[PDB]
């Protein structure tokens, strides 16, 4: 079940056993909200990617003690005050495979990523950057342009207002046969108790390229940035056994 929980009071000083670095708090801050220790994620009007001038969200990287390189789940809760405008979606974060680019319109032969995005009206999708020059049998799973979305129909308006939404994302490596990846990797997403699973993934090209870190980086879009100054709260970041 839950292997460990991030202590947000250590987020800017190494994260304890989560081995956090790469921290960019931007305008966000660890605080208390609804009696929980949370991060208030501050999204300025017109914030998003670096193509957008406002400041929004926050980021950090973690390699927790106990990270299982073959399969692992990360989980968190998020509160959207009534009135929050989800626009046309944005990122939370997720699990990165191997080393090298796998996000931001850039791919690599050795890296992949499995992330949560929100969508319009509070939807959720699994958003995957697969590696360059690696066979996939899942239709549309190609390492070109932006990442590939899954579960569009399955989490429509899943993210509700004025409550703690529970989100999880699980990642399980493919196996290898004589160094050949076997198109048997998996992903799953859970939102407020509903689980959807994706099988038949090649997550890497070689048995030394495995699950390597959790990268958190929340922001609107691209391409559509935050329509207004607004906040959301994140809490209870957990690393969990892959179910």
For residues 210-223, b (16+ Cβ closer than 10 Å) or e, as one string? bbbbbbbbbbbbbe
According to the annotation, is 172 in a ligand binding site? no
CA pair distance 23, 4, nearest whole angstrom: 19
For position 200, which CATH number holds? 2.60.120.200
Dig out the tokens for 53 from the structure. 């001038």
Reduce the DSSP state of residue 28 to 3 states and report it: coil
The structure tokens listed for 178 are 């004589």
User: How many domains are contained in the chain?
Assistant: 1
Nearest 10 degrees: Cα torsion 57, 61, 65, 69:
110
Residue pair 215/113 in contact (Cβ under 8 Å)? The answer is yes
Q: Do 201 and 175 touch, CB atoms closer than 8 A?
A: no
DSSP 11-24: GGGT-GGG-EEEEE
- Binding site annotation covers 149? yes
Contact assessment for residue 57 and residue 217, using Cβ atoms and an 8 Å cutoff: yes
Cα(134)–Cα(89) distance, rounded to whole angstroms?
Answer: 28
Q: Residue 98: helix, strand or coil by DSSP?
A: strand
Q: Is 195 annotated as a binding residue?
A: no
Domain of residue 161 covers 1-243
Q: Cα dist. 130→82, 111, 136 in Å?
A: 35, 8, 9
Q: Is 88 annotated as a binding residue?
A: no
Vertex 203 angle, CA 190 and 95, to 5°: 45
d(CA 95, CA 128): 10
3 state DSSP class of 57:
coil
Query: Whole-angstrom Cα distance, residue 190 to residue 168?
Result: 5
Q: Phi/psi at 15 (nearest 5 deg)?
A: 70, 15
**DSSP for residue 8:** G
Q: Which residues touch 169 (CB under 8 Å, ≥6 apart)?
A: 73, 74, 75, 94, 95, 114, 115, 116, 126, 187, 188, 189, 190
Left (φ > 0), alpha (ψ -120 to 50) or beta: where does 18 sit?
A: alpha
Rounded Cα–Cα distance for residues 129 and 114 (Å): 7
Instruction: Give the integer Cα–Cα distance in Å for 33 and 234.
Output: 10
Q: Give the resolution value in Å.
A: 1.7
Query: Per the annotation, does 115 bind a ligand?
Result: yes
HSE-up of residue 149 (Cα within 13 Å, Cβ side): 15
Q: Experimental method used, please?
A: X-ray
Ligand-binding site membership of 104 (annotated): yes
152: annotated binding-site residue? yes
By CB neighbour count within 10 A (0-12 exposed, 13-18 middle, 19+ buried), where does 227 fall? middle
Q: Is 119 annotated as a binding residue?
A: yes
Widest Cα–Cα separation across the chain: 54
């Amino acid at each position: 079940n839950v292997i460990s929980t991030l202590d947000l009071n250590l987020l800017t000083k190494g994260g304890g056993s989560w081995n956090v670095d790469g921290v960019n708090m931007k305008k966000s801050a660890v605080t208390t909200f609804d009696g929980k220790r949370v991060v208030k994620a501050v999204y300025d009007k017109n914030s998003g990617t670096s193509a957008n001038p406002g400041v929004g969200g926050f980021s950090f990287s973690a390699v927790p003690d106990g990270l299982n390189k073959n399969a692992i789940t990360f989980a968190w809760e998020v509160f959207y005050p009534k009135g929050f405008d989800f626009a046309r979606g944005g990122k939370h974060g997720g699990t990165f495979i191997g080393h090298g680019a796998a996000s931001g319109y850039q791919h690599s032969k050795t890296g992949a990523s499995n992330r949560i995005m929100w969508q319009e009206k509070g939807g959720v999708i699994d958003y995957i950057y697969p590696p360059s020059d690696l066979k996939q049998k899942i239709p549309g799973l190609d390492p070109e342009g932006h990442g590939i979305g899954f579960f569009q129909d399955d989490f429509k308006n899943a993210l509700k207002y004025d409550v703690w939404n529970r989100i999880e994302i699980g990642t399980k490596m493919n196996t290898f046969k004589n160094g050949i990846p076997q198109l048997d990797g998996e992903s799953y997403v859970i939102v407020n108790g509903k689980k959807e699973v994706l099988k038949r993934i090649n997550w890497s090209r070689s048995p030394d390229l495995l699950i390597s870190r959790f990268d958190w980086n929340t922001f609107f879009g691209g391409p559509l940035p935050s329509p207004k100054n607004q906040v959301a709260y994140f809490t209870n970041f957990q690393m969990k056994k892959y179910e």
